[PDB]
Amino acid sequence: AILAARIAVSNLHKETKKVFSDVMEDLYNYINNGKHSPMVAKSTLDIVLANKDRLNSAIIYDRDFSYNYFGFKTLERSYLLKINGKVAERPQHMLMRVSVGIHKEDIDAAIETYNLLSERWFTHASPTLFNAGTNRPQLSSCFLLSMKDDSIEGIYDTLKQCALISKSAGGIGVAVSCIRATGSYIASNGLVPMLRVYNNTARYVDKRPGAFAIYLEPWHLDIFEFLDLKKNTGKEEQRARDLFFALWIPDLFMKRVETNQDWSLMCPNECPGLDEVWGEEFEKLYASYEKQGRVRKVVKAQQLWYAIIESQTETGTPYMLYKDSCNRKSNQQNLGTIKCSNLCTEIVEYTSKDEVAVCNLASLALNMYVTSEHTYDFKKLAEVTKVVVRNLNKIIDINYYPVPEACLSNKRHRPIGIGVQGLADAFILMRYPFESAEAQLLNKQIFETIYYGALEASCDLAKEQGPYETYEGSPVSKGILQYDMWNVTPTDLWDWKVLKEKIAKYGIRNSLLIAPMPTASTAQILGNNESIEPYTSNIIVNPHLLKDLTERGLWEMKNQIIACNGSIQSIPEIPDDLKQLYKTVWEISQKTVLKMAAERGAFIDQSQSLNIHIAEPNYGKLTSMHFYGWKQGLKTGMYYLRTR
Ligand SMILES: C[C@H](c1cccc2c1CCC2)[C@H](NS(=O)(=O)c1ccc(Cl)cc1C(N)=O)c1n[nH]c(=O)o1
Ligand SMILES: Cc1cn([C@H]2C[C@H](O)[C@@H](COP(=O)(O)OP(=O)(O)OP(=O)(O)O)O2)c(=O)[nH]c1=O
Ligand SMILES: [Mg+2]
């Protein structure tokens, strides 16, 4: 497979022009019909030709050879622009296009970005990679919204918003608690038939079928029916299988589950405003409605708990979000109550009828900052973060917004989401088992570093461009950073005092900064394990384990690993230090996974797309897992449940 990739990359170089500007000209002048349909933007081309000598000479075509086989084949499929079904763009062409698309006339910045991207220190999000240096550059990854109104008018205005966004390659998170339930007066069919409309809309507007995550609060009267919608067994009229499901969960629910108290299901039209308040304020409003008997049904909290867990055991959903933790520990709390997260559970941004929140995303490749000394290069990590911040910050200003509420929101608050990939690789390269105390300090210190670098850059930008419009009155404005909100003290690695002085002086440019996304595609391209996830299995054979065994002349063996679905724990010849290092996710404590998410979480001002891998799950296991996560203060307690 090593040789296979070289052949493939070579073949592509043979079948492509070498000069970057020639490929940019071909792409612009592209003609179908016989209509001039440019595959790149006029502005970008005008700039590329104006700086063609420096831009064409900046590019290092040997870097195309760094891509592994499957990563390279992913690129050809989706990321390299095609003329007439044939690839015109080399990967380096695409990165420079991306680089110039973001940085425009600033050639020094564009080449700085080019070099960082082609050496794979970090990557931008797929939509950026697709559309940067193009007409209608939709570079932002996903979106969040609230139902406009509890009316056919608002419901259908929101459906159109979703259709327009989904057509322009956006994933969606949708808050739907404010919509009235089944059997309810109109001066109502309720939620399930409304969601069927959204479901068919996702199918209709792709090619990848539209990706809509539906967020419901567990007090909603339709909650039990919500939980059935993803089940592969039922009547077509009672189901919606192309949608994705999330619960937006108050502390009060979990408290009453824990104490085996009653739980009241309410109609939002009768019991308004529950999604516009959080914590104590919610608990007062909710209690007060119970005491007014504005309550459509009463169940044991534990009966709803069981149905939540039944649902997850069957489908792996719903996603578990902790509303109160999300709102309490958000720099956006000055804007009002946050009603949902997004498609991937990592983004925690404010929505209103006027505002559709946007996810501007990138990921740092944590593998790259380990030295041959087996030391982590935190300084370099922070330097690259600063660049990504400047890049994402520019993306807000150049992005083509599919609805104007997305534009108003992103410009008002300027949130970004910087993530990571290769966490499990960085541990392996430092010789630290994922669960080890050593991995645990490094986990902490990586995200401390990321958050520090991010803030510094965002502060530098605020010095230059002034603070974001809603900055005054946010927790950061009063000297409160994310770790403060968790009552955590950082390690001695970075000087926060110095940073907090700069922030107090100048402000910051971005309301939020950090959000570890799934990195499902880009991780594969770059040859790293996905996001913050443990090593999923040891089989191609894993390149670090392969290398380690080869070096010890312990490389039959590919076949025994296949025999055990990727474990090397049974195999007797492999020494115990390597076994610890290459435990698969199924041999790794999820309690420790959750603890590590919480520990990082103190330096994550958004949230994390945290999957949970339980091999043989049952009711108690999932109950323990959820309550542990919730009690740790996690914003996202679970993205997908994954099982063996
Ligand atoms: C469900 C349970 C669990 C998860 C999260 C929090 C808590 C628990 C039990 C107490 C609190 C979880 N059990 S488990 O998932 O079945 C499991 C146990 C040990 C190992 Cl090595 C692997 C696995 C696995 N991935 O499949 C767990 N992680 N750590 C632990 O002690 O139990
Ligand atoms: C008209 C109609 C509304 N609905 C739902 C959508 C909304 O959740 C809710 C309200 O729809 P509306 O369009 O607001 O109906 P309305 O204006 O008559 O009601 P009110 O004066 O009480 O506001 O009812 C249906 O499910 N089926 C229907 O045929
Ligand atoms: Mg109405």
Side-chain angles (χ1 to χ4, degrees), residues 1 3-34 36-135 137-184 186-206 209-234 239-539 542-555 557 559-564 566-643:
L3 178 53
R6 180 174 318 120
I7 301 280
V9 170
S10 195
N11 286 353
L12 177 62
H13 285 192
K14 275 153 179 199
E15 290 303 314
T16 46
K17 291 182 180 193
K18 162 157 150 268
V19 180
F20 163 69
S21 46
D22 289 352
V23 175
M24 299 304 279
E25 277 187 56
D26 292 3
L27 296 161
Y28 177 66
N29 301 325
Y30 181 79
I31 254 154
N32 197 331
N33 177 272
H36 182 212
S37 41
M39 297 213 74
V40 26
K42 184 49 168 171
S43 25
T44 305
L45 181 64
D46 285 325
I47 285 156
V48 165
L49 298 170
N51 310 268
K52 67 192 291 202
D53 288 12
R54 199 190 175 195
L55 286 176
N56 297 341
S57 223
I59 292 177
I60 310 294
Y61 292 104
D62 279 7
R63 290 166 188 171
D64 286 347
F65 285 95
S66 66
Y67 297 103
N68 79 62
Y69 180 81
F70 283 98
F72 187 67
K73 291 277 152 214
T74 310
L75 286 168
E76 296 208 303
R77 196 163 303 121
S78 303
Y79 299 81
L80 308 179
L81 288 180
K82 295 174 149 165
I83 286 173
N84 296 145
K86 196 197 177 186
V87 177
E89 274 190 322
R90 294 176 179 183
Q92 305 312 305
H93 293 138
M94 176 270 292
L95 297 179
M96 191 61 90
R97 161 171 56 85
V98 169
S99 307
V100 185
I102 295 165
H103 292 299
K104 290 172 151 32
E105 331 209 297
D106 198 319
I107 306 313
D108 288 357
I111 289 169
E112 186 189 50
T113 282
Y114 163 71
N115 283 133
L116 289 167
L117 291 172
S118 56
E119 292 193 336
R120 311 191 303 170
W121 292 94
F122 89 98
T123 187
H124 272 94
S126 297
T128 293
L129 299 183
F130 291 158
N131 303 325
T134 274
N135 297 128
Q138 214 304 292
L139 287 14
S140 285
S141 84
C142 45
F143 298 83
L144 296 78
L145 34 75
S146 288
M147 282 284 199
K148 249 157 208 286
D149 196 49
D150 181 34
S151 70
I152 289 303
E153 289 88 344
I155 288 164
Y156 278 81
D157 285 340
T158 299
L159 185 65
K160 186 193 178 196
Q161 269 175 154
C162 298
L164 286 172
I165 285 147
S166 186
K167 110 169 162 161
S168 98
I172 285 167
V174 197
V176 306
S177 297
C178 74
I179 297 307
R180 75 191 72 154
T182 304
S184 312
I186 313 179
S188 186
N189 261 325
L191 211 62
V192 171
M194 186 216 55
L195 288 177
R196 287 201 75 212
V197 174
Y198 276 71
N199 188 93
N200 283 9
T201 288
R203 287 179 74 83
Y204 176 61
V205 181
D206 303 313
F212 307 175
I214 314 299
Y215 281 80
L216 193 64
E217 298 184 38
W219 52 256
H220 200 273
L221 179 60
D222 285 328
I223 188 69
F224 283 90
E225 289 57 63
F226 193 73
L227 293 170
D228 292 341
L229 293 169
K230 194 90 185 176
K231 284 169 186 179
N232 319 63
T233 117
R239 295 287 176 279
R241 277 108 167 191
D242 312 296
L243 298 174
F244 294 93
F245 304 95
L247 300 175
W248 192 235
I249 303 181
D251 296 346
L252 184 61
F253 172 62
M254 298 292 287
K255 287 194 298 204
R256 292 210 185 167
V257 162
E258 198 185 334
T259 54
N260 199 26
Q261 282 178 235
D262 284 337
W263 181 244
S264 303
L265 309 179
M266 297 166 186
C267 183
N269 186 48
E270 290 167 21
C271 295
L274 297 175
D275 57 344
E276 311 207 309
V277 293
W278 62 272
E280 293 178 76
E281 199 180 355
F282 165 86
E283 300 190 348
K284 269 154 192 213
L285 190 53
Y286 183 79
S288 151
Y289 289 150
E290 292 192 307
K291 287 163 167 176
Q292 298 159 18
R294 301 204 212 177
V295 167
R296 292 277 288 272
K297 205 185 182 191
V298 182
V299 304
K300 295 289 164 277
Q302 275 185 24
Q303 173 177 318
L304 179 56
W305 188 249
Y306 180 93
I308 290 168
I309 278 150
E310 185 173 50
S311 187
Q312 294 165 346
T313 297
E314 279 193 55
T315 71
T317 63
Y319 312 156
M320 301 286 276
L321 277 106
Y322 297 113
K323 166 187 184 198
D324 298 327
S325 295
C326 287
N327 276 277
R328 199 180 292 109
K329 295 181 300 194
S330 174
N331 196 45
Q332 282 194 356
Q333 72 187 55
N334 65 324
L335 308 166
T337 297
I338 295 160
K339 287 183 181 202
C340 59
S341 188
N342 71 326
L343 177 60
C344 308
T345 79
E346 86 283 43
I347 302 291
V348 179
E349 299 179 1
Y350 179 79
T351 59
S352 68
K353 103 173 88 80
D354 289 354
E355 297 187 21
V356 170
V358 195
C359 320
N360 315 276
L361 305 189
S363 60
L364 292 147
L366 300 179
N367 56 108
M368 291 284 295
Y369 303 84
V370 179
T371 68
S372 293
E373 224 74 288
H374 305 143
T375 41
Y376 209 86
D377 188 349
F378 297 114
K379 193 178 192 202
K380 179 63 172 183
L381 184 61
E383 285 173 45
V384 180
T385 302
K386 293 191 66 143
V387 179
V388 179
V389 169
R390 286 180 181 274
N391 292 4
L392 290 170
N393 195 69
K394 291 177 175 183
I395 285 168
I396 293 163
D397 297 314
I398 72 175
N399 190 70
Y400 166 82
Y401 293 98
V403 303
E405 291 90 337
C407 185
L408 183 59
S409 163
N410 233 11
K411 299 271 200 206
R412 254 173 202 179
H413 316 126
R414 305 194 71 81
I416 64 173
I418 294 172
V420 303
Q421 59 181 73
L423 184 67
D425 302 86
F427 297 159
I428 287 162
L429 292 172
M430 296 283 281
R431 318 313 289 172
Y432 301 158
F434 199 101
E435 302 164 282
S436 73
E438 295 102 337
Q440 296 186 217
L441 189 71
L442 184 59
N443 185 50
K444 288 205 202 142
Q445 288 183 329
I446 286 163
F447 291 85
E448 273 177 12
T449 300
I450 285 156
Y451 192 44
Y452 195 96
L455 281 163
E456 201 177 76
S458 197
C459 187
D460 288 336
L461 292 163
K463 164 161 155 193
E464 298 156 29
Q465 310 177 2
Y468 61 91
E469 176 190 321
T470 55
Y471 174 68
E472 283 305 320
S474 73
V476 175
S477 73
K478 295 166 190 198
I480 298 164
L481 298 175
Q482 178 67 19
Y483 57 88
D484 293 317
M485 304 176 105
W486 293 69
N487 301 129
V488 158
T489 297
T491 77
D492 288 336
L493 193 63
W494 294 96
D495 186 336
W496 296 97
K497 193 177 136 283
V498 164
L499 184 56
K500 290 173 101 159
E501 284 175 353
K502 288 139 86 147
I503 291 174
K505 208 164 190 321
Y506 294 112
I508 52 176
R509 188 63 177 151
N510 301 290
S511 73
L512 305 164
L513 291 165
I514 312 301
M517 69 294 292
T519 75
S521 295
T522 62
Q524 216 211 288
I525 292 165
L526 269 50
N528 301 333
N529 212 53
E530 333 210 286
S531 66
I532 49 79
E533 299 297 335
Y535 196 61
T536 184
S537 89
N538 286 285
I539 36 65
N542 184 254
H544 304 295
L545 169 67
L546 170 67
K547 177 162 140 150
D548 277 3
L549 298 176
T550 289
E551 249 146 57
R552 296 184 191 194
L554 301 156
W555 195 257
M557 200 140 223
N559 286 325
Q560 305 119 248
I561 294 158
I562 296 157
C564 316
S567 180
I568 66 147
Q569 303 306 297
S570 55
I571 293 164
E573 33 276 353
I574 297 175
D576 285 340
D577 73 304
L578 296 194
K579 269 165 181 179
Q580 299 259 83
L581 205 52
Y582 296 108
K583 277 156 131 166
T584 66
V585 73
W586 313 113
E587 294 148 2
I588 285 169
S589 170
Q590 300 308 274
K591 180 175 175 207
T592 298
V593 163
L594 278 171
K595 189 194 186 225
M596 298 171 64
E599 273 159 7
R600 285 189 280 273
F603 302 90
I604 295 165
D605 54 0
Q606 315 228 216
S607 189
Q608 302 167 242
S609 311
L610 187 72
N611 301 125
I612 298 294
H613 305 77
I614 292 166
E616 290 165 37
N618 62 48
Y619 172 97
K621 281 182 147 178
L622 294 181
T623 297
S624 279
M625 189 280 290
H626 288 144
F627 275 81
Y628 186 78
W630 167 61
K631 289 180 168 145
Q632 280 291 98
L634 284 170
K635 296 181 195 191
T636 300
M638 193 181 82
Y639 181 27
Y640 276 99
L641 177 56
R642 299 286 186 207
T643 63

